[PDB]
Design a protein around this motif. Structure first.
Motif, mmCIF file in Angstrom:
data_model
loop_
_atom_site.group_PDB
_atom_site.id
_atom_site.type_symbol
_atom_site.label_atom_id
_atom_site.label_comp_id
_atom_site.label_asym_id
_atom_site.label_seq_id
_atom_site.Cartn_x
_atom_site.Cartn_y
_atom_site.Cartn_z
ATOM 1 N N UNK A 124 0.853 -1.177 0.000
ATOM 2 C CA UNK A 124 0.000 0.000 0.000
ATOM 3 C C UNK A 124 0.888 1.226 0.000
ATOM 4 N N UNK A 125 0.555 2.192 -0.864
ATOM 5 C CA UNK A 125 1.286 3.453 -1.016
ATOM 6 C C UNK A 125 0.466 4.600 -0.441
ATOM 7 N N UNK A 126 1.104 5.509 0.307
ATOM 8 C CA UNK A 126 0.430 6.741 0.698
ATOM 9 C C UNK A 126 1.214 7.944 0.183
ATOM 10 N N UNK A 127 0.499 9.054 -0.031
ATOM 11 C CA UNK A 127 1.066 10.260 -0.631
ATOM 12 C C UNK A 127 0.667 11.463 0.207
ATOM 13 N N UNK A 128 1.659 12.284 0.577
ATOM 14 C CA UNK A 128 1.417 13.527 1.301
ATOM 15 C C UNK A 128 1.975 14.697 0.495
ATOM 16 N N UNK A 129 1.382 15.865 0.725
ATOM 17 C CA UNK A 129 1.825 17.123 0.150
ATOM 18 C C UNK A 129 1.926 18.168 1.256
ATOM 19 N N UNK A 130 2.835 19.110 1.061
ATOM 20 C CA UNK A 130 2.985 20.212 1.990
ATOM 21 C C UNK A 130 4.290 20.933 1.746
ATOM 22 N N UNK A 131 4.565 21.903 2.619
ATOM 23 C CA UNK A 131 5.883 22.531 2.580
ATOM 24 C C UNK A 131 6.990 21.496 2.772
ATOM 25 N N UNK A 132 8.128 21.754 2.129
ATOM 26 C CA UNK A 132 9.262 20.830 2.172
ATOM 27 C C UNK A 132 9.598 20.451 3.614
ATOM 28 N N UNK A 133 9.653 21.439 4.511
ATOM 29 C CA UNK A 133 10.043 21.133 5.881
ATOM 30 C C UNK A 133 9.037 20.210 6.564
ATOM 31 N N UNK A 134 7.743 20.407 6.296
ATOM 32 C CA UNK A 134 6.705 19.609 6.935
ATOM 33 C C UNK A 134 6.637 18.195 6.347
ATOM 34 N N UNK A 135 6.854 18.054 5.042
ATOM 35 C CA UNK A 135 6.882 16.724 4.433
ATOM 36 C C UNK A 135 8.054 15.917 4.980
ATOM 37 N N UNK A 136 9.211 16.554 5.133
ATOM 38 C CA UNK A 136 10.359 15.856 5.699
ATOM 39 C C UNK A 136 10.054 15.385 7.110
ATOM 40 N N UNK A 137 9.483 16.271 7.933
ATOM 41 C CA UNK A 137 9.168 15.914 9.312
ATOM 42 C C UNK A 137 8.141 14.795 9.360
ATOM 43 N N UNK A 138 7.067 14.941 8.585
ATOM 44 C CA UNK A 138 6.040 13.907 8.532
ATOM 45 C C UNK A 138 6.617 12.577 8.054
ATOM 46 N N UNK A 139 7.441 12.600 7.007
ATOM 47 C CA UNK A 139 8.008 11.355 6.497
ATOM 48 C C UNK A 139 8.861 10.673 7.558
ATOM 49 N N UNK A 140 9.668 11.444 8.290
ATOM 50 C CA UNK A 140 10.472 10.833 9.343
ATOM 51 C C UNK A 140 9.581 10.136 10.364
ATOM 52 N N UNK A 180 -0.899 10.015 -9.142
ATOM 53 C CA UNK A 180 -1.969 10.394 -8.197
ATOM 54 C C UNK A 180 -1.417 11.085 -6.959
ATOM 55 N N UNK A 181 -0.893 12.299 -7.147
ATOM 56 C CA UNK A 181 -0.219 13.011 -6.068
ATOM 57 C C UNK A 181 -0.753 14.417 -5.862
ATOM 58 N N UNK A 182 -1.761 14.840 -6.618
ATOM 59 C CA UNK A 182 -2.287 16.198 -6.501
ATOM 60 C C UNK A 182 -3.181 16.365 -5.276
ATOM 61 N N UNK A 183 -3.265 17.601 -4.784
ATOM 62 C CA UNK A 183 -4.369 17.939 -3.901
ATOM 63 C C UNK A 183 -5.678 17.689 -4.651
#
Lengths: 104, 101, 104, 104, 104, 101
Positions: free
Chosen positions: B42-58, B90-93
């Motif tokens: 299963x794949x999930x996709x997030x969008x946001x500011x670079x700093x927030x995506x990095x934090x969320x991914x960690x 499939x990565x758009x808002x």
């Protein structure tokens, strides 16, 4: 279209996302579609001039290694596809990506 | 959108549930969609500011281990994805997740 | 809903059937849906108060062994899932199961 | 139609793309469709006079090797397929490819 | 319905065809549905009185060995399923099979 | 219908194409449908008199080897299938194949 076609397939979606972004940022090419191939493999298809597809494909191949856990499974360039192949297989330009074709 | 994109893929759904919840609780990011990739991945996709995506991914990477039997298979961050990619993959808002932006 | 979510995934459908029946009979929980995950794996999702999800999940894990040939592959409990997760992933309460939520 | 049918299946999409392009450029044949077979395998189907299907198939088999990472899994030629097979299996000529049949 | 549920899953479709036929010929049970589980595995679901589901299941298990190349992967009997499980999972009686339920 | 049912499943589509063509050319049978089973396996289903299904199945089994790279995975004949099975599993005669009956 008689534009060249490039196709690249990875294990995992993150690898195909990395490859697609590198391709369209490095060659004057259009990403026209992707395929869920099964078994967590994903295929992407680009179109453009043959020399631009070559440049994009090299960048895409190298970008796959930037995705943790991604694997490059298979790829090809078809320099000038027959209209019957473009019709049946999912490799044609489409209205969703026309504005990027114009840009190339 | 020129927002960063993060994508993470697990073996099994519980692992992706764990990862997604950690991501949106730690970064100011939007979970925009998920993919049944086949082979129980299963794949999930997030969008946001670079700093927030990095934090969320960690946070999401670490959260996968909290799901018994889950495995983290693959992940990537693209800080500034090309508009052509957002259009096809499939990565758009989307309107379903507008309120989370 | 801020109710906890539990998810459990088996190799084979019979195992997930056994687990689901044990879960909703043990905890004040609602089975909200299932997923065909591929590779003959099946995922089930329950919602309810966290303490009820924990007891239901314990029973579901043990019930998988009652199906010959089943394997428990993976499971998790998220005590207070974020609304964005409930929206995108298939874990929300839905009108098909409303009467079971009411009874909990 | 009583035209022969050829079918070829690869591991990965790039291999089937290479094979299809070689086939329709080599024989007076029509590519009528493709199948996502699962496990990242892809099937293509061509129709035409038996002698043209044989030469096209030879070229398609050899073209698979031009795709990095592709594997040729399986192929067959049926010289005069039964109408019941053409009806049930996805091997018939169709309106999407009519103009390519005409040209053969 | 509070009737028992039996579920059996084979590798390959021929095995599930053999098992389904044996089940409904030996127990006073209704075959209500089947699932393509992926990876060439197929699941069938029967309903009936618990003692009849037990008898049918034994016959179905033995019938799988009569299909060349078939394998029995997994099976279960749930004697009295909760309505929430019957609602969410594909195990309910349906209008397509009502006349066979009446017959049992 | 109380007609016999035969089902055969191959690894790869070409093998099932070979098998199906041999079946309908050798037995007075109707190919009623096929299944994409997953894992590149394909199932075909025939109906007819018991004697014709047996003959067709024998020819189909032997025909699988004529497809390079094909494998015969599994097959069965049910001489007199229960009506409940015909209803639920995809083995019935259908209007698409009526003319072949």
């Amino acid at each position: 279209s008689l534009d060249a076609v490039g196709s690249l397939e990875t294990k995992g979606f993150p690898g195909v996302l990395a490859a697609a972004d590198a391709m369209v940022k490095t060659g004057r090419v259009t990403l026209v579609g992707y395929i869920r191939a099964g078994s967590a493999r994903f295929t992407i298809i680009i179109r453009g001039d043959v020399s631009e597809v070559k440049t994009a494909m090299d960048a895409g191949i190298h970008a796959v290694d930037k995705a943790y856990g991604a694997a490059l499974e298979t790829w090809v360039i078809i320099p000038r596809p027959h209209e019957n192949v473009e019709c049946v297989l999912p490799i044609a330009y489409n209205e969703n990506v026309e504005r990027f074709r114009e840009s190339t």
